[PDB]
Design a protein around this ligand. Structure first.
Ligand SMILES: [K+]
Ligand SMILES: [K+]
Ligand SMILES: [K+]
Ligand SMILES: [K+]
Ligand SMILES: [K+]
Ligand SMILES: [K+]
Ligand SMILES: [K+]
Ligand SMILES: [K+]
Ligand SMILES: [K+]
Ligand SMILES: [K+]
Ligand SMILES: [K+]
Ligand SMILES: [Mg+2]
Ligand SMILES: [Mg+2]
Ligand SMILES: [Mg+2]
Ligand SMILES: [Mg+2]
Ligand SMILES: [Mg+2]
Ligand SMILES: [Mg+2]
Ligand SMILES: [Mg+2]
Ligand SMILES: [Mg+2]
Ligand SMILES: [Mg+2]
Ligand SMILES: [Mg+2]
Ligand SMILES: [Mg+2]
Ligand SMILES: [Mg+2]
Ligand SMILES: [Mg+2]
Ligand SMILES: [Mg+2]
Ligand SMILES: [Mg+2]
Ligand SMILES: [Mg+2]
Ligand SMILES: [Mg+2]
Ligand SMILES: [Mg+2]
Ligand SMILES: [Mg+2]
Ligand SMILES: [Mg+2]
Ligand SMILES: [Mg+2]
Ligand code: NA
Ligand code: NA
Ligand code: NA
Ligand code: NA
Ligand code: NA
Ligand code: NA
Ligand code: NA
Ligand code: NA
Ligand code: NA
Lengths: 66, 105, 137, 33, 104, 244
RNA sequence: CAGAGGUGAAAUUCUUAGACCGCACCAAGACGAACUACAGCGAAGGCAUUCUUCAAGGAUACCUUCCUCAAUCAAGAACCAAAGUGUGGAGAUCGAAGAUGAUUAGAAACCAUUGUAGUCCACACUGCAAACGAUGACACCCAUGAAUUGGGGAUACUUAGUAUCUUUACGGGAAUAUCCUCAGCACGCACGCGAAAGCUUUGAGGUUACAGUCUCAGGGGGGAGUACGUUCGCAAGAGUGAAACUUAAAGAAAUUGACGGAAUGGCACCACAAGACGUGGAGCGUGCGGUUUAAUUUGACCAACACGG
RNA sequence: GCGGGGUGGAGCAGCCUGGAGCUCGUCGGGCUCAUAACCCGAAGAUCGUCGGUUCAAAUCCGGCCCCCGCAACCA
RNA sequence: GCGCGGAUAGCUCAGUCGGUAGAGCAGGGGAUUAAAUCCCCGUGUCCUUGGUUCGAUUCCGAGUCCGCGCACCA
RNA sequence: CACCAUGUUCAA
C-alpha cells in the first residue's frame, strides 16, 4: 500500500514560494527485490532533510527535474 | 477629502434613509435542537443509575447525562453517591472533572 | 487468457506498438509486424475525464498499462516500438506522453524489441496553418 | 516599434483613407458629367 | 531609427543576392527568410537517463553495446519565437558582435 | 475524454453478447525467402474462413517489416540500421510464403549521416532484373575533407557530382539487370554491391560515405508458383494448426 | 473499437451509418526538407530533386583580330515582387470576404473550426514595394590579418622551398598542401572623414588646402503626392503636379534619468509561502466625513482618520 | 369593421386565478492612487384606469384612455 | 382506428430485463489559486391501474398525454 | 502565453 523511501539528497527548492522541495530517494526494499537499490526523483511537501524517510505509496512516477 | 463627484444633498439624504437595517446575516448559523434534560431524578431514571450505570467501563458525568437524559449537575451528584457506596471507583479527579469506572468482579 | 500462438512457455512473441504522442492526446496502438491486424489501442483520453490531461504523462502511463494487460491475453510478450510526433507540416517535437508510455510498457513487464522514430517528414511540404505572421498569441 | 513618431495615424491607413476619398470624388463628378 | 546591425539581422550582403525564400517557423509558422531565421540543429535523446535505463533493461537489443536512437531535427525559429523561447537573448552592444561557428 | 460523446450512433439508442475478438483469430507464420537464415520471422493473426470470405484472400499481399539484423541473425551493426519488407505471395497451410518488397535505412541512421559543410549527393536508379522485377535504388553519398585539408568546407563541383551519378547508374544497371531477384537481394543485404560503388566512385571524388538508403520493388511479374517454391527452398513446418 | 479534434480552459467540429489510429496502395494539385552557408548565378525583380535538351552569360587563358569605335544620359523603349484585372484550365494545402465557437464591458479583432476570391498554369493587362546597401553610373589612389567562390601559373642586392589520400573509367584522373595571380561576395580596419551612430582598397576617405566626367533629386513642418488639367490603363490605378490657408518648430544622432504585461542576479513576513491572532458581522469608547446648528473652531485625506501629545 | 399590447427607472417574460420574474439601471461595502471593469449585499412593482365574478384576479368577464397592425372593393 | 417510440430527481437521460433506482447540469458545502478542475451531500410515490415472478421501473392486459408513419360509407 | 481600458487646463 505504501513503500518507504529514504531521501538520498535534496535537489533544491522547487517552484515559486519555495514550499516544494525536489529530492532524490532510494527505495528501501529487501535484497534481491526488483525495487532494491532503485532510485527515483520526487517532489516533497514540508520540511525535509537528508536521511529522511517518506512513504511514497506510488513509485512509478518521477518528478520533472527543476 | 474624497468628496464624491456629482453627489447631492438629496442623494446624501436618500442614501442614509435607505441604509437602515437590510444588509446583515453573513453567517449561516445552522440552528440546533434543544436538549431536554431533567433536573431531578425520576423513579425509573434513578433505578437505571443504580443498576445500569455501574459495569460501564468509562463513567463520566457528561456520559451519564447523555444516557439518562438528565442534567450534568445531578448526573455528577449521583456518581458521587455511587462512590460513597463503593459501587464505582474514581480513577481521575479534580475540581472541574471526575472520571469513574466499574469495580472488578 | 491463452489466445496465443503455439509456442513454448517463455518464447518471445513480438508485436509492434505505435506510440503517437501529440500535445493534445497520446495513442498506444499495438499491431503485428505488418501493421494490418491490431490487438489493442488505448489512448490517453480514454483514461482521463478532463480534456487538458489527455496528453499528460500520467494518462499515457495509464494507457500503456491497459495495453500490457490486453497484450498478455493475446499472447504478446515483446514489442517493437515506433514513436511518432504530429509531423507533416506540423511540429516534429514529440508530445509529453511519449516517454511515459514507453517506460510504462517496460516497467509493467515487456521486452522492448526495437525503437524507431517514424514521424512524417516532408521532403517538401504544403503551406502550414496560420498566416505569414504565424500564430499571434 | 521600428519607425519614429508618426504625428498621426498609421501612414498606410491614411494613404488608404485618401485612396477611398479620391474614389468617391471621381464618382461624384461622373454623375454630374 | 539608427542602424542596429551591419548584418541587418540576416546573412545577406548588399550585392550577394536579392531574395531568399522564407521558411515556416518551428513554433508558430511565421514566414521568415531562411538566412534571417535563428536555426538550431538539435540531437535529442528519446528517453531521459532514468527512462532509458528502464527501457534498456527490458530490451534484448539495447544496452551498453548498442546505444538507443536519438532525434535529429533542424529547427528554424522566427526572431520573436527564438527570443521568447530563450534560445537567443538580447546582448550588450559590445557583446552583440561575437559569433559562434560551432555548437558549444 | 471519458463520458464526453454526445452522438454515439447517428441513429440513436444502443443495439451483442460481448463476443471476444481473439476467439475468431488464427495464428500464422511469416516465412522469408531462402537467402535469409531466420526464415520464420514474425507471427500474425487472421480471421477464420467464414462464409465466402476465405482467409487466404485477405492474407495475400500483406507487407511484413523486419530488421535485417534479426533476419540475418549475425554480422555487425551496419545491418542493425536496415529494415526489410516482404510481401505475402502464398499461404501454405499456416505459413505465409513471402517475397522481397523493399529495404530501407532507419530514420535515425540516415538523419545522423548529415554533416553541414559537405555536399550531399543523391542518385535514383531504376533497373529491371532478369526475372522481370523493377526496382528503384536511391543511393546517397557525402563528400569528405582530406586529412591534409585546412579548408572550411568540402563542397564538390557540379560536374564531379554529375560524374558520380552517371557512374553509380552504370554500375547498378550493369549488375542488377543480369541477376534474378534472389541474387539482387543478396547483393544488397550483404553490402557487396555497396562496396563496389564506393571503391569505384572514390577516385572521382573523396567520399565520406556511399550507401544505398532505400530499395523498393515498383513492378512485379505475373505470379509463378514454381518460382516462389524455388526462392524458399525447404519451407520450415508450421505448428500453428497442430493440436495442443 | 469509443472516442477523436481543438484550446490558457473550452466550444464550434467529426464519430458504433465505425471517427481517431494502423499497414500497403490509388487520385489530384502544390512544393522540392536535412545538405542550406556574412555561399553561387542574374540588369534588377528573382533563381534550389534528377535526366535529356535549346539558345545564351560572366570570369579566366592568349605574342588572335580591330584601332577610339567610349562614359553618362532629357525624349523613347524593354523588363519589373506581391496583391489586383480579362479569358481558358486547375483546385490538394493555405486562405482576403463570409459563417460558427470563444474571449471581452464591448471584440463578425488577436485564439479555434471552416470557407469564397485567390494561391498553381497558358495567353494578355497593371507598373503602385522598407523595388533597401534607405548609399546613382564610369575612372584613379588607398594600411593590415584570417578566410571564401570561379579561372589560371609553379612544386636600398644578380634571382632562393614543399607534402597527402583514392585510383578499372565523362580518367595522361579527382581532391588536397604550399606560394603567386586575375575576377566576385564579404569579415575582424591604419590614415582620413563624420553631429554622432558609424564608413574605411566593398568609403560615407583622398573637400573652406573647396575643380576627373555625366546625370537624378532636395530647400522648415503641414495642407499634399491632395485639387485642377492632361497622357496612359478594362478597371484598380500610374505619370505629371499646385495654390489659398496654417504653423515655431518638425526632424537627426548621442547622454543621464525614469518607466516596461523585456532579460539577469539578489533582498524584505510595512511581501508572499507554512501558520498564529485578529480586524470586516454585534454593542460600546474614540477619531474622520456627512447631516444639523447661532456656533457645532480648525490642520492632516502607503507617508490623514486614540494623529496635532 | 377585425386582431393584438399597457408589468420596479429602461427593455421584456409570466399572462394556463392564490405571484410578479430576467438583463440593465439605482444604492451600500470591497479591489484601485483614482474611475471603469470585477467581487460581496440591498432596495425598488395601483401589473394602464373604472367596475363585475370568485374564498381569492397580472392572470377571468365588461367599459374607458392610449399604442400597433389588417381591411377600406365594383362602379 | 392500426403498428412503433417516450412518460424516471428542479432540467436532459441510461436502466438491470423477471430478487436491490443511477449519471451530466442546477443548489449547498470543502481542496483551490479568477473562472474553470477535483471531493461530499444532492434528491425522484420510476405516466394511471389490475394481473403481483419470492417480490414487478423490469413481465403482461387495459386507459391518459405527446412525437412518427399509415385507414377513413351514418 | 486566461482577462489587465483610462487619467481635465497652465505652472513648480
Ligand atoms: K489566419
Ligand atoms: K552598426
Ligand atoms: K553577383
Ligand atoms: K527584395
Ligand atoms: K475502416
Ligand atoms: K482551413
Ligand atoms: K495621381
Ligand atoms: K536616437
Ligand atoms: K513604514
Ligand atoms: K465630527
Ligand atoms: K475616455
Ligand atoms: Mg507575444
Ligand atoms: Mg492577450
Ligand atoms: Mg523597440
Ligand atoms: Mg529602434
Ligand atoms: Mg524618417
Ligand atoms: Mg570548396
Ligand atoms: Mg480530445
Ligand atoms: Mg533536395
Ligand atoms: Mg526616362
Ligand atoms: Mg500573382
Ligand atoms: Mg486571375
Ligand atoms: Mg482563419
Ligand atoms: Mg517608389
Ligand atoms: Mg532611397
Ligand atoms: Mg566643391
Ligand atoms: Mg518644403
Ligand atoms: Mg500589506
Ligand atoms: Mg465592529
Ligand atoms: Mg459596520
Ligand atoms: Mg514606505
Ligand atoms: Mg495616528
Ligand atoms: Na538572424
Ligand atoms: Na476588456
Ligand atoms: Na534594407
Ligand atoms: Na564563382
Ligand atoms: Na491626375
Ligand atoms: Na535614454
Ligand atoms: Na498566510
Ligand atoms: Na471580526
Ligand atoms: Na495659463
Amino acid at each position: 500500500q505504501a513503500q518507504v523511501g529514504l531521501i538520498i539528497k535534496v535537489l533544491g527548492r522547487t517552484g515559486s514560494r519555495g514550499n516544494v522541495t525536489q529530492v532524490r530517494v532510494r527505495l528501501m526494499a529487501e535484497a534481491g527485490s526488483p525495487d532494491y537499490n532503485r532510485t527515483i526523483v520526487r517532489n516533497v511537501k514540508g520540511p525535509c532533510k537528508e536521511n529522511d524517510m517518506l512513504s511514497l505509496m506510488e513509485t512509478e512516477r518521477e518528478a520533472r527535474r527543476l | 477629502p474624497p468628496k464624491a463627484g456629482q453627489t447631492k444633498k438629496a442623494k446624501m439624504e436618500a442614501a442614509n434613509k435607505g441604509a437602515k437595517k437590510t444588509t446583515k446575516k453573513w453567517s449561516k448559523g445552522q440552528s440546533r435542537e434543544a436538549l431536554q434534560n431533567a433536573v431531578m431524578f425520576d423513579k425509573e431514571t434513578y433505578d437505571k443509575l443504580r443498576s445500569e450505570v455501574p459495569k460501564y467501563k468509562l463513567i463520566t458525568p457528561s456520559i451519564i447525562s447523555d444516557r439518562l437524559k438528565i442534567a450534568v449537575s445531578i448526573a455528577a451528584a449521583g456518581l458521587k453517591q455511587l462512590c460513597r457506596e463503593k459501587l464505582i471507583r474514581l480513577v481521575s479527579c479534580s475540581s472541574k472533572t471526575r472520571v469513574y469506572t466499574r469495580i472488578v468482579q | 487468457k491463452a489466445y496465443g500462438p503455439n509456442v513454448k512457455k517463455g518464447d518471445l512473441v513480438y508485436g509492434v506498438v505505435h506510440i503517437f504522442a501529440s500535445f493534445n492526446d497520446t495513442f498506444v496502438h499495438v499491431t503485428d509486424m505488418s501493421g494490418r491486424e491490431t490487438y489493442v489501442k488505448v489512448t490517453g483520453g480514454m483514461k482521463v475525464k478532463a480534456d487538458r490531461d489527455e496528453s499528460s504523462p500520467y494518462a499515457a502511463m495509464m494507457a500503456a498499462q491497459d495495453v500490457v494487460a490486453r497484450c498478455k491475453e493475446c499472447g504478446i510478450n515483446a514489442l517493437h516500438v515506433k514513436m511518432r510526433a504530429v509531423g507533416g507540416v506540423r511540429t516534429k517535437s514529440p508530445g509529453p506522453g511519449a516517454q511515459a508510455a514507453l517506460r510504462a510498457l517496460a516497467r509493467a513487464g515487456m521486452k522492448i524489441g526495437r525503437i524507431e522514430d517514424v514521424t512524417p517528414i516532408p521532403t517538401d511540404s504544403t503551406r502550414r496553418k496560420g498566416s505569414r505572421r504565424g500564430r499571434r498569441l | 516599434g521600428t519607425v519614429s513618431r508618426p504625428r498621426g495615424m498609421r501612414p498606410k491607413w491614411h494613404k488608404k483613407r485618401i485612396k477611398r476619398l479620391k474614389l468617391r470624388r471621381r464618382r461624384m463628378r461622373q454623375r454630374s458629367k | 531609427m539608427t542602424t542596429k546591425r551591419r548584418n541587418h539581422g540576416r546573412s545577406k550582403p548588399a550585392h550577394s543576392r536579392g531574395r531568399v525564400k522564407p521558411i515556416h517557423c518551428f513554433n508558430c509558422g511565421r514566414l521568415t527568410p531562411k538566412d534571417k531565421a535563428v536555426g538550431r540543429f538539435v540531437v535529442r535523446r528519446m528517453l531521459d537517463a532514468a527512462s532509458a535505463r528502464d527501457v534498456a533493461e527490458a530490451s534484448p537489443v539495447y544496452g551498453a553495446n548498442f546505444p538507443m536512437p536519438r532525434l535529429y531535427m533542424k529547427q528554424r525559429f522566427c526572431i520573436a519565437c527564438a527570443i521568447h523561447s530563450r534560445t537567443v537573448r538580447a546582448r550588450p552592444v559590445g557583446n552583440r558582435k561575437i559569433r559562434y561557428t560551432k555548437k558549444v | 475524454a471519458l463520458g464526453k460523446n454526445k452522438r454515439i450512433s447517428k441513429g440513436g439508442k444502443r443495439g451483442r453478447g460481448k463476443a471476444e475478438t481473439m476467439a475468431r483469430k488464427e495464428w500464422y507464420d511469416v516465412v522469408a525467402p531462402a537467402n535469409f537464415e531466420k526464415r520464420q520471422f514474425a507471427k500474425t493473426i487472421c480471421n477464420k474462413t467464414q462464409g465466402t470470405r476465405i482467409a487466404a484472400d485477405v492474407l495475400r499481399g500483406r507487407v511484413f517489416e523486419a530488421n535485417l539484423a534479426d533476419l540475418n541473425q549475425s554480422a555487425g551493426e551496419e545491418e542493425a540500421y536496415r529494415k526489410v519488407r516482404f510481401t505475402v505471395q502464398e499461404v501454405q497451410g499456416r505459413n505465409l510464403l513471402t517475397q522481397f518488397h523493399s529495404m530501407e535505412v532507419t530514420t535515425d541512421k540516415m538523419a545522423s549521416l548529415l554533416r553541414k559543410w559537405c555536399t550531399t549527393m543523391e542518385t535514383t536508379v531504376e533497373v529491371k532484373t532478369a526475372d522481370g522485377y523493377t526496382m528503384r535504388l536511391f543511393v546517397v553519398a557525402f563528400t569528405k575533407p582530406q586529412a591534409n585539408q585546412q579548408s572550411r568546407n568540402c563542397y564538390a563541383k557540379q560536374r564531379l557530382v554529375k560524374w558520380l551519378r552517371m557512374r553509380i547508374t552504370k554500375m547498378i544497371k550493369r549488375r542488377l539487370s543480369k541477376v534474378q531477384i534472389k541474387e539482387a537481394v543478396s547483393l544488397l543485404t550483404r553490402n557487396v554491391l555497396s562496396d563496389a560503388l564506393v571503391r569505384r566512385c572514390n577516385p572521382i571524388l573523396p567520399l565520406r560515405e556511399l550507401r544505398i538508403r532505400k530499395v523498393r520493388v515498383v513492378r512485379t511479374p505475373k505470379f509463378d508458383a514454381q518460382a516462389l517454391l524455388s526462392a524458399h527452398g525447404t519451407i520450415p513446418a508450421s505448428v500453428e494448426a497442430d493440436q495442443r
